[PDB]
Design a protein around this ligand. Structure first.
Ligand SMILES: CC1(C)S[C@H]([C@H](NC=O)C(=O)N2CCCCCC2)N[C@H]1C(=O)O
Ligand SMILES: CC1(C)S[C@H]([C@H](NC=O)C(=O)N2CCCCCC2)N[C@H]1C(=O)O
Ligand SMILES: CC1(C)S[C@H]([C@H](NC=O)C(=O)N2CCCCCC2)N[C@H]1C(=O)O
Ligand SMILES: CC1(C)S[C@H]([C@H](NC=O)C(=O)N2CCCCCC2)N[C@H]1C(=O)O
Ligand SMILES: [Zn+2]
Ligand SMILES: [Zn+2]
Ligand SMILES: [Zn+2]
Ligand SMILES: [Zn+2]
Ligand SMILES: [Zn+2]
Ligand SMILES: [Zn+2]
Ligand SMILES: [Zn+2]
Ligand SMILES: [Zn+2]
Lengths: 266, 266, 266, 266
């Protein structure tokens, strides 16, 4: 006789879980996650902002890296998200319990975060994480200002309904650097055409390619660094090969068109 | 010396609170709210659907009208909403406690409903109601089927971010009737241009006019019946003067353009 | 170099996941879960009640067993819980999406259920499941009546803060049978003395032993059947060896006292 | 013909809404609410704690008084509550949006706060306010430490299920002062005996009288100052006539016993 299957944990490549020391991107912006998952710390005189946290088990490592940067738990004021999947929003609930931080997100990301990624449009309950509540709901194009750094939300629905690009301006070598943290544009295993849970999926992805192609973007970063050709382990050359926003959008669109053709053939 | 002001209740014109008996719209669709607020009951062999409930104090009247139609509390299966303001979603929390009904709404309407209309983008906490939780989140173009009546969601953001038109096909005199319950297109007292809480408000309203103009629409109904020229007190002629979806969208757009010009002058 | 550990799934003994056909307990009460996890279906003329659902992966099996009993998804009206851990409330969110059922629970169980068992007082995030919202909050001693079966809540805090015993009267061989579904009284790996997250843990367990010892109890059932000496695989003798409520409470108290002494020695 | 009644706002005596300047209670504890509603600010080197905020319309006045005390919005770290009725938790949602503050409350208070006081066991939807989410759930006897001030929760269910007394030690004239902020012990208009929504109401009130009588209590404060014989308008003599915890508990119990006798006669 045959029991029901055991629950399967969301397991990932080791590099996604490999801790790294903080890597400086610009004068106030640092990568503080793992070798293969982005978690950006932006340090202002009026507190710190974290954009993404990676996987659920990364909370203590993130807090250690914040401490190394001079950011104590009370100094973390705001958490922003690219999208509310387990590999990017995983440790948010724990970070809220252990720091002063509040979460700002759009309505779609907020509802997915509040269910811990369960009832995902494409994954069901296969990839979940501890639920968290948003403290502020943002609209498309809304700005949030922390210590004079202005973060602008650009909705780019597709990978999730609530997928968002965040943009801000930092400095480097005395000159402004317009940073674009653009969300994933992948559709891994998704049913694209005629999806009853996401009827306008294709139209949304197409608009999102155009949104990403037009972002203010001297430096592009992505939740999975390989998607924008970053190599966080490469030290002084980590960002040397990074794509432009235009090249990232074009590559994602070509991949998407090929996936559509393969789905029609399947 | 001067105390802080007393809380001010959301008071409305008497006709919005004037009970009426059920008024038949089509073979299975009835208006069961008040003279001046729409609440639509759609009766299927597999249970009943309510679209909107009006003001918070309308719950018992709605239940009385459902009983008169042969719908007991256990028979009410689904509540859908045009938008989550107090004059349309007011009694939802109470209806959920007193019936078998579950709520389906988009993410924007769900988050506003869960805060009881508080922290409204335009009204602040001036117009609130008992909070309720959604049981199902719908995406644009998603269908919900109850007893073979197919309800399709058409997002039409503007009046609220989560504003939705719902369409379904009923019958009358042996022939199909495509019913369009289109949301409000008003912007009462709103700051339209450069609104920090709703940066793309104007673009959203413009897209929503186009969405409404294109809906499948033999009969249009609106949350405030006067907006579509219904007169629920007029008996056999209640719907005689009703606007088409095209005329409703055109009228709303002309009014909106005049409001934009007045805001620029103000 | 050393990555962070992979997430660990909540894995359990195979017998906890071994499907069984419905086993009748009384005229309207059936065990419909697995060999080693209780999930009770109570069938009334006015719909069905489910008490517990076991592990998250049991949802489809529960629905199959309900169908075999003549209970369709629309007929399931109410879900009650012993306590909101993953091995008892696991499939609640999915059952709510797939049936007409609403959840009634005390405030403590409701808050734990809404966080999917995360931030557990003793387990942290080690044992989680998809979050769900309660539709009705019950107080100690409150009754819920479905089709003339009266369910009474008896709070018995300890194993979780919101641990509850549910009692009702069914019939068998023409005579009343007072059924007591008493929650777990175990404290597996818990810090009992001086626990900062549960300062009055010991006092609560002691009161709960007394509560269980006094329940109306012709037949005792427990979330883990072995705790009350049920053997769901034993057919016509499944309940033959079952403990009385008094014996269950006494055994749990003796075990608890031994655990206290071992903790003092450790 | 007769419309349904208009919604009725929760209106209160003017003195409950009369702003006052901060009144010092001890070296770090100040009354910063109105003449007749308590809102306590405790100032530590590691941020400020607010216990209660009064009515919904008091948010801006509270923030003004915090500023006068040298507490900016980012400095407010924690909000604690006596109980989650509109006249004590009214401005919590707004304070969370406008400050860094997080809320800690027991499960019962958290669920009532999250529904904005709707579906009250005794008032229904008659007395509601903007909903807010708790960030931390506390258990009976749990401590929360801010800047070396230790706040201890003492549950005292009755007035609401989640009613809580908070105790801490401050200093005055070089000597320790054990402050007890004890919740309301009133039952205004409540059905006490055989209440289906609160079956053990009487037993809970009786235990709560005993809890209050035993609190560490050099100085008692209450959410309605008159209940403990404070007169916040009396300047240097505001606390001169204050009751002891023992006298407050005894007075509440005598009043409760008289109410029970009147209910039996009614
Ligand atoms: C394409 C990715 C880099 S892989 C990861 C994905 N999770 C969610 O989408 C993920 O692990 N899956 C599990 C295994 C593969 C198929 C299902 C998906 N995140 C994607 C992203 O952000 O673009
Ligand atoms: C234009 C309406 C028919 S009046 C009502 C409105 N409430 C929310 O929007 C409402 O009572 N207000 C209060 C008084 C007027 C100004 C603020 C708005 N609903 C609108 C709708 O659905 O189009
Ligand atoms: C004692 C049980 C029968 S074992 C199970 C427990 N989970 C939660 O408490 C559970 O699997 N653990 C994982 C492994 C053992 C130690 C941590 C606990 N439930 C208990 C119950 O309801 O009495
Ligand atoms: C007895 C109070 C001082 S009067 C106020 C009460 N609200 C909630 O309980 C309140 O205004 N009511 C409205 C009018 C009277 C009857 C219903 C109650 N709060 C009580 C408290 O905290 O002891
Ligand atoms: Zn993803
Ligand atoms: Zn990813
Ligand atoms: Zn409106
Ligand atoms: Zn309206
Ligand atoms: Zn358990
Ligand atoms: Zn268990
Ligand atoms: Zn009160
Ligand atoms: Zn009060």
């Amino acid at each position: 006789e045959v029991p029901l299957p055991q629950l399967r944990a969301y397991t990932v490549d080791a590099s996604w879980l490999q801790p790294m020391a903080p890597l400086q991107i610009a004068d106030h912006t640092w990568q503080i996650g793992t070798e293969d998952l982005t978690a950006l710390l932006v340090q202002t005189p009026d507190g710190a902002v974290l954009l993404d946290g990676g996987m659920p088990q990364m909370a203590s490592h993130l807090l250690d890296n914040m401490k190394a940067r001079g950011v104590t738990p009370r100094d973390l004021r705001l958490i922003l998200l690219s999208h509310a999947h387990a590999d990017h929003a995983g440790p948010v609930a724990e970070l809220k319990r252990r720091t002063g931080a509040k979460v700002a997100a759009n309505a779609e990301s907020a509802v997915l975060l509040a269910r811990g990624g369960s009832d995902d449009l494409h994954f069901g309950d296969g990839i979940t994480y501890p639920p968290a509540n948003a403290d502020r709901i943002v609209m498309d194009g809304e700005v949030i200002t922390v210590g004079g750094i202005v973060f602008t939300a650009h909705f780019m629905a597709g990978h999730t309904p609530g997928s968002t690009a965040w943009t801000w301006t930092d400095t480097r070598n005395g000159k402004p650097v317009r940073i674009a943290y653009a969300d994933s544009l992948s559709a891994p295993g998704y049913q694209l055409q005629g999806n009853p849970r996401y009827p306008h999926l294709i139209e949304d992805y197409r608009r999102s390619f155009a949104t990403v192609r037009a972002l203010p973007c001297d430096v592009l970063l992505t939740p999975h660094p390989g998607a924008s050709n970053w190599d966080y382990a490469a030290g002084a050359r980590a960002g040397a090969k990074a794509l432009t926003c235009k090249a990232y959008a074009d590559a994602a669109e070509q991949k998407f068109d090929g996936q559509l053709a393969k789905e029609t053939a399947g």
